[PDB]
Paper text:
The crystal structure of the TgMIF homotrimer has been determined to 1.82 Å, and although it has close structural homology with mammalian MIFs, it has critical differences in the tautomerase active site that account for the different inhibitor sensitivity. Crystals formed in space group H3(2) and x-ray diffraction data were collected at the Diamond Light Source. Second, Pro15, which is conserved in mammalian MIFs and functions as a helix “breaker” between the η1 turn and α1 helix in HsMIF, is substituted with Glu16 in TgMIF. As a result, the α1 helix in TgMIF is longer than in HsMIF, extending from Pro13 to Leu31. Third, the central pore of the TgMIF trimer is narrower than that of mammalian MIFs with a minimum pore diameter of 3.5 Å at Arg61. However, replacement of Asn97 for Thr98 in the TgMIF tautomerase active site is of importance as this substitution prevents the formation of a hydrogen bond between MIF and the substrate molecule, l-DOPA methyl ester. Further substitutions around the TgMIF tautomerase active site are observed whereby Val106 is replaced by Trp107, resulting in possible steric hindrance that prevents the successful binding of ISO-1 to the active site.
Herein, we produced recombinant histidine-tagged Toxoplasma gondii MIF (TgMIF), a 12-kDa protein that lacks oxidoreductase activity but exhibits tautomerase activity with a specific activity of 19.3 μmol/min/mg that cannot be inhibited by the human MIF inhibitor ISO-1.
Author numbering:
A (entry chain A), B (entry chain A), C (entry chain A): 1 to 114
The structure:
Amino acid sequence: PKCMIFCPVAATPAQQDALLKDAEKAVADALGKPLSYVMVGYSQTGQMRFGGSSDPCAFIRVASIGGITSSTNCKIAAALSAACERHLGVPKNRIYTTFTNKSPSEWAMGDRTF
Amino acid sequence: PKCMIFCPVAATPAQQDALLKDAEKAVADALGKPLSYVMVGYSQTGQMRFGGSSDPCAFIRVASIGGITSSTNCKIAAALSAACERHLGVPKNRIYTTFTNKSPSEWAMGDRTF
Amino acid sequence: PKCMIFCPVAATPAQQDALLKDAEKAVADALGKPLSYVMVGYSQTGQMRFGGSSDPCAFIRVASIGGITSSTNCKIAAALSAACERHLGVPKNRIYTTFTNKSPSEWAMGDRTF
């Protein structure tokens, strides 16, 4: 699985480390996949707006080979939004999380597809 | 809806503010969705190449729950490309815009899916 | 086609230039599409983790209008992973490459869809 967080907040690598540790656990747990297959990252964007406001907001992209369902997506979004609020100060209601189901052939690690 | 612009141009936050204001309006207008649900951002990439040239270029990703159609995508791309040209100096013919239709269950705000 | 590489490595623009030249050629070759239509970029992320480790890793997103298949994806991933290893020092087995097939109507260049 993959989880990438995009946010204008200038997070210190130590905020980022704690956030990403929370993120990887939540994604592995919800999808029932080994942590060894979970990739997570933080990317500081330039400016971001949401609802016509420059107030802090975030968006996160999560992808998996299967496991993408209404219930599981909601679980992941709840956990990820809460972690961003905790670590970045971004209100959870200003965080969009979107989910993408990938076919095994659409996902490679090194020189091999799944 | 979501619109994220990726470009190597070192845009000043004030270029970015004006760009993103143009972007949010164009996306809301084309999709007939309230501005309150529109998220927009700018991300300065490292190097980008297009057509084998390092000349300035950009790519933008736009996602929505429904509303993704040939006519509507063309309208959004016309408006977004033009805004990047105006605010960033990037020729519109060196801007790729790609569109993604999301199911409601694939999109969360805070701890709730749509 | 589009290929975007996300990695925490602080690559010098000259590492980036060489990487992206390798990337554009490999994508054009595998998909049998003209270089004129290939867009490539590098984005230095903040922190990234993979498998519960902060050791260097990367993820790359590749999109095309058609041409996305198990064999072709594997070819592209092999070439891209190898280039990142060569130019960035990131072990190829710590690189995820994911593939997205786009409809022509979902892809615009300037003010026109494909």
